[PDB]
Amino acid sequence: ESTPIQQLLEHFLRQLQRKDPHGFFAFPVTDAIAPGYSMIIKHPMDFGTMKDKIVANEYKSVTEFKADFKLMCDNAMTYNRPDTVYYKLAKKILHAGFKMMSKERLLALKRSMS
Numbered sequence: 001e002s003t004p005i006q007q008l009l010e011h012f013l014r015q016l017q018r019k020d021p022h023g024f025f026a027f028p029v030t031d032a033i034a035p036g037y038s039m040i041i042k043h044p045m046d047f048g049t050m051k052d053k054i055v056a057n058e059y060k061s062v063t064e065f066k067a068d069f070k071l072m073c074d075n076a077m078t079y080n081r082p083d084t085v086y087y088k089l090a091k092k093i094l095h096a097g098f099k100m101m102s103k104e105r106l107l108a109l110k111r112s113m114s
């Protein structure tokens with residue numbers, strides 16, 4: 001079934017999803033739920049899509065995965081007002097991921113791979 005990089009990335013995704021227990025980031029945002037979204041946000045992303053990409057083996061590196069994670073958070077902070085739940089939760093997730101996938105963390109991981 002899986003490869004080592006796929007397992008690492010599924011680990012990171014599970015930990016990130018735990019901060020969103022209601023699933024606001026689980027599926028794509030549509031124009032029905034968010035008026036005019038498709039005008040304002042050109043490159044949509046969500047946790048469901050990221051999971052599908054991991055399973056299809058579309059990510060070559062943690063860099064590539066981290067870039068989709070930050071796009072998802074930036075989209076939500078661009079579209080939604082600061083006072084909203086969606087904005088506040090996107091900021092919470094963004095911090096968690098930057099900490100979880102820091103250069104310091106990945107260095108330690110790379111040292112344990114000898």
Ligand SMILES: CC(=O)c1cc(-c2ccccc2)c2ncccn12
Nearest residue numbers: 024025029033034075076079080086
């Ligand atoms: C992630 C996001 O921007 C989002 C999720 C939702 C959302 C809310 C309830 C149920 C499903 C998604 C939403 N609603 C209005 C404006 C923005 N959003």
